């Protein structure tokens, strides 16, 4: 229950939320290991810190795809969409921090005549 499938870059994160103690499960693996950076760890709890429910629910995460930071962003959007399903009363609170928005930034495409997205080969006058 409480399905809040969220996305970031190339990552898709399906999150089912249940009341509990606060344990986070990612692909049948402890979340201390999957996310090594404590800096990447705080952003996971932003939807859980605007509303005081951090030590009340357990998240079961089955993410697939994207880089290690990619799942961190996609799991933040994952819980917020699922948490908003728990009670619509949280919408003004989460909207203030811009947590419902799905980030639209994606890596560009390479262009012919260019060495990347916008890099231009060195110009020589003469």
């Amino acid at each position: 229950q409480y399905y809040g499938t969220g996305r970031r870059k190339s990552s898709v994160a399906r999150v089912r939320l249940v009341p509990g103690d606060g344990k986070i499960v990612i692909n049948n693996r402890d979340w201390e290991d999957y996310i090594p950076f404590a800096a990447l760890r705080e952003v996971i709890k932003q939807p859980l810190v605007a509303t005081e429910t951090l030590g009340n629910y357990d998240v079961l995460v089955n993410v697939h795809g994207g880089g290690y930071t990619g799942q961190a962003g996609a799991i933040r959007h994952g819980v917020a969409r699922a948490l908003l399903q728990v009670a619509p009363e949280y919408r003004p609170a989460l909207k203030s921090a811009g947590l419902l928005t799905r980030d639209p930034r994606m890596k560009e495409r390479k262009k012919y005549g260019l060495k990347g997205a916008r890099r231009a080969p060195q110009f020589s006058k003469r």
């Binding site: 950076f37 404590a38 800096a39 760890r41 705080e42 952003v43």
Partner: protein, 154 residues
């Protein structure tokens, strides 16, 4: 000739452990080639030396280190007919902090010790005691700007 003028500015996220804005803006300044782990880790461990060597507060001492090297005046040269005159001018609030971190890290690389870990931590100690290269350069900016006080507004 073109361009509309003012533009938006980037946001900063509050880092864990040492919740601050200068710390987050300092991590991104000394990062190279988008390696957050390398640059972030040396800063977090550097604060340990700040506590062990002279333990006052890792959050503090770093503070007045910044407020001792941030310049108050600035020079923005302009070319007049015949000769170029270095015009003194104030420094905005945003560039106040930017010119501090850049001066801190440019001279932290030139300190000349074994690791960047020690070099950055030691440099802020000297700044917190009104000493070092970072403090030295700000005085050069002030001395030059106050030497040309004549055509400040004129």
């Amino acid at each position: 000739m073109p361009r509309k003028g003012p533009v938006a500015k980037r946001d900063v996220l509050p880092d864990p452990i040492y919740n601050s804005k200068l710390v987050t803006r300092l991590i991104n300044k000394m990062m190279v080639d988008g390696k957050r782990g390398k640059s972030q880790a040396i800063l977090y461990s550097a604060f340990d030396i700040i506590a062990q060597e002279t333990g006052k507060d890792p959050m503090e001492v770093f503070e007045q280190a910044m407020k001792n090297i941030m310049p108050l005046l600035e020079v923005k040269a302009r070319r007049v007919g015949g000769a170029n005159y270095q015009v003194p001018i104030e420094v905005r609030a945003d560039r106040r902090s930017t010119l501090g971190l850049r001066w801190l890290v440019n001279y932290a690389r030139l300190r000349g010790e074994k690791t960047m870990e020690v070099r950055v931590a030691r440099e802020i100690m000297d700044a917190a005691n009104n000493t070092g290269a970072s403090v030295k350069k700000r005085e050069d900016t002030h001395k030059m700007a106050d030497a040309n006080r004549a055509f400040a507004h004129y």
